[PDB]
């Protein structure tokens with residue numbers, strides 16, 4: 452008879468190309484029209500291109516400018532050169548031919564169909580983390596599978612993910628401290644994690660508890676992070692063990708054109724350890740001290756992550772409060788630094804909030820099994836976490852196999868010291884409203900708008 456046989460269907464990265472070819476068992480001269488139709492899962496037939504015996508070629512608006520329908524009457528084949536591909540293209544492509552038999556009537560002919568897959572693995576992780584190293588793991592994944600792994604780091608991703616991932620597509624996998632994940636889980640923005648016992652057993656059982664909401668695993672634990680006191684050993688060999696002796700040290704250092712302590716005052720995660728050192732009466736004590744530092748001109752009013760980091764790395768401030776991730780940038784600079792216990796306030800220790808960096812799969816993602824493969828077999832491995840860690844340090848990784856290397860690092864010891872003096876954040880959905888209440892409270896008291904007693908009043912509501 453005159454059967455049509457399609458070919459060239461495979462997997463490709465968006466922006467890549469594919470040449471579909473449909474050969475017939477008869478001369479294409481006899482056909483009136485030849486063309487390509489596509490069908491995506493659960494959708495109607497969509498014509499993409501057609502070519503008539505008159506050499507006129509038409510295309511659908513989505514593929515127009517990107518696809519060309521060609522014909523070779525010698526090879527008895529119709530082609531579809533698909534250039535600059537997109538995820539919307541993903542579908543089963545079918546070849547169609549129409550023929551006018553010698554009389555008035557016509558004959559429609561179809562092929563088997565050829566599957567075309569345009570998949571891209573997109574990861575959202577914060578810009579203060581090791582996205583370049585995470586990309587080196589993503590580059591090894593594409594070598595062993597053929598899937599593209601792009602790594603994105605957009606600003607305000609913790610509050611841009613639940614808006615974009617709900618409505619739009621957003622990322623496949625989202626990386627953030629475990630505390631934000633309960634709100635995503637309650638809203639239905641995260642797929643339930645189902646890792647086999649052998650993978651499950653590779654990580655510390657306490658780390659899995661942080662990524663659990665209502666008896667369901669909602670993410671993969673990566674690493675335990677806690678803030679420590681980072682100090683310049685040359686400007687300050689015996690740094691303050693107490694918060695209350697910093698004003699004296701600052702008077703001493705300001706005479707030599709140097710600050711004592713500069714850290715991010717805008718984000719409440721950095722000011723919370725001082726606020727929670729005693730506790731209420733503890734929050735009032737801790738914050739009043741922080742307010743007195745800005746009131747005594749020891750710290751700047753709008754001290755943010757960048758000017759604090761830059762000032763410490765430049766060698767302008769003797770101390771800073773930051774996490775594991777910040778160390779690599781200090782190593783890049785020529786600063787002999789030390790990481791140590793956070794200063795004590797009112798004798799008791801400053802209790803930082805402990806975060807578990809965790810990777811969750813977006814509920815509205817088609818690549819859920821491909822992301823599980825990346826996370827399990829490529830990222831959460833001795834080799835995978837080493838790549839991320841040599842870019843920007845992860846802190847105390849959740850991988851059991853890393854115990855000896857973590858224990859050999861003095862900065863990890865100081866991180867674990869502060870993590871024990873602190874406490875793990877509950878993952879609850881109210882954490883977002885809580886953090887916002889503390890973010891405003893600290894900024895208002897820092898700038899000089901609301902009083903310390905009125906800040907805890909508005910925050911407890």
Ligand SMILES: OC[C@H]1O[C@H](O[C@H]2[C@H](O)[C@@H](O)[C@@H](O)O[C@@H]2CO)[C@H](O)[C@@H](O)[C@@H]1O
Pocket residue numbers: 577579609627628630631676718719720721806886
């Ligand atoms: O600032 C409040 C903010 O703090 C925590 O976020 C940390 C994040 O966990 C760290 O990995 C680091 O990058 O800095 C963030 C603060 O700058 C909480 O996880 C987050 O919910 C909260 O908004």
